[PDB]
Amino acid sequence: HWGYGKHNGPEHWHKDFPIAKGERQSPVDIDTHTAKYDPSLKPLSVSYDQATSLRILNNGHAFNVEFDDSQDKAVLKGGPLDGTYRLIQFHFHWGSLDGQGSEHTVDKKKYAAELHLVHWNTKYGDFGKAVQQPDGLAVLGIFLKVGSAKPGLQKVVDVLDSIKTKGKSADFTNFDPRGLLPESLDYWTYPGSLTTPPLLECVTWIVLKEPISVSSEQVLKFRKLNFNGEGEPEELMVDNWRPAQPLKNRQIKASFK
Numbered sequence: 379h380w381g382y383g384k385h386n387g388p389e390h391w392h393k394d395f396p397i398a399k400g401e402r403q404s405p406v407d408i409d410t411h412t413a414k415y416d417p418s419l420k421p422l423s424v425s426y427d428q429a430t431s432l433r434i435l436n437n438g439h440a441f442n443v444e445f446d447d448s449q450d451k452a453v454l455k456g457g458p459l460d461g462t463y464r465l466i467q468f469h470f471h472w473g474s475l476d477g478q479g480s481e482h483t484v485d486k487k488k489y490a491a492e493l494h495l496v497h498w499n500t501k502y503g504d505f506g507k508a509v510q511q512p513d514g515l516a517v518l519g520i521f522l523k524v525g526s527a528k529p530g531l532q533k534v535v536d537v538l539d540s541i542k543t544k545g546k547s548a549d550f551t552n553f554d555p556r557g558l559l560p561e562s563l564d565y566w567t568y569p570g571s572l573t574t575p576p577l578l579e580c581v582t583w584i585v586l587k588e589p590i591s592v593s594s595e596q597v598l599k600f601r602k603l604n605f606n607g608e609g610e611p612e613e614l615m616v617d618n619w620r621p622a623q624p625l626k627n628r629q630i631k632a633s634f635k
C-alpha cells in the first residue's frame with residue numbers, strides 16, 4: 379500500500395488513485411506575487427472555545443488528534459466558506475531536517491512542517507459524504523518554522539512516546555487547538571484536494587501566511603515516531619509530505635494586501 383518511500387511514495391500514487399494527476403490537486407506552490415488580493419474575502423471565523431479532543435492515533439503515515447464532531451463544538455466559517463465546517467482532526471507533515479517538510483510552499487520556500495486542521499461541511503451530515511463533494515472540506519494549513527518552542531504544542535509532543543508505532547492510540551482529552559494558531563489569520567485560499575490517498579478533490583484550502591515557531595526539540599520528537607507497526611523493523615516517520623502539484627486552471631486568492 380501507499381506511503382512515502384522510494385517504492386510507494388507520491389510518484390507511485392497515481393497507479394491506485396488516478397486522480398493524483400487531476401485538475402485540482404494539492405499541495406501547490408503559493409507564488410505570492412501572482413496571488414490576487416480579493417477584498418470580497420471575509421475574515422476567517424475560528425470558533426474552537428468548545429472543542430472536545432478525544433484521542434491521538436498513529437495511523438502509519440502521521441498522527442491524528444481526533445475531535446468529537448457529533449455537534450457544532452469546534453467550527454470554521456467565514457473566509458471563503460459558505461456555511462459551517464466542523465473540526466474532525468488535525469495532523470502534521472514534517473521532514474527529516476528543518477529545510478523540508480511542508481506540503482505547500484511559499485515562493486518555493488519549504489517550511490520544517492505543516493499543520494492541517496481538517497473540517498467538514500455540515501450540509502453533508504458526515505465526513506464520508508463530505509469528501510464526495512467539491513465544497514465538502516475546509517483544511518486550515520499552518521506552517522511551522524524551527525526557533526522558539528510553541529507552548530501549546532508540548533502536550534502533543536509529550537504523548538508521542540505512547541503512540542510510537544502504526545495502530546497505537548492514546549486518550550487525548552482536553553487539548554485546546556487554539557494553542558497551535560499564529561497571531562494573524564491572514565490567509566491564501568484555493569480549491570484543491572486531500573494531499574494523501576484517496577486524493578479526493580473536495581477541499582477549500584485556507585493557508586495562513588504567518589507560520590508558528592516550534593523548537594528543534596519539539597520537531598525532533600516528531601521524527602522519533604515510526605511508520606512501521608510494533609515488533610517490525612524501525613522506519614522513522616519523516617518526510618511524510620507530498621510535493622507541490624501543478625496549479626493548472628486555478629487562482630490563489632489573498633485575504634490581505
Ligand SMILES: [Zn+2]
Pocket residue numbers: 469470471494573
Ligand atoms: Zn495533511
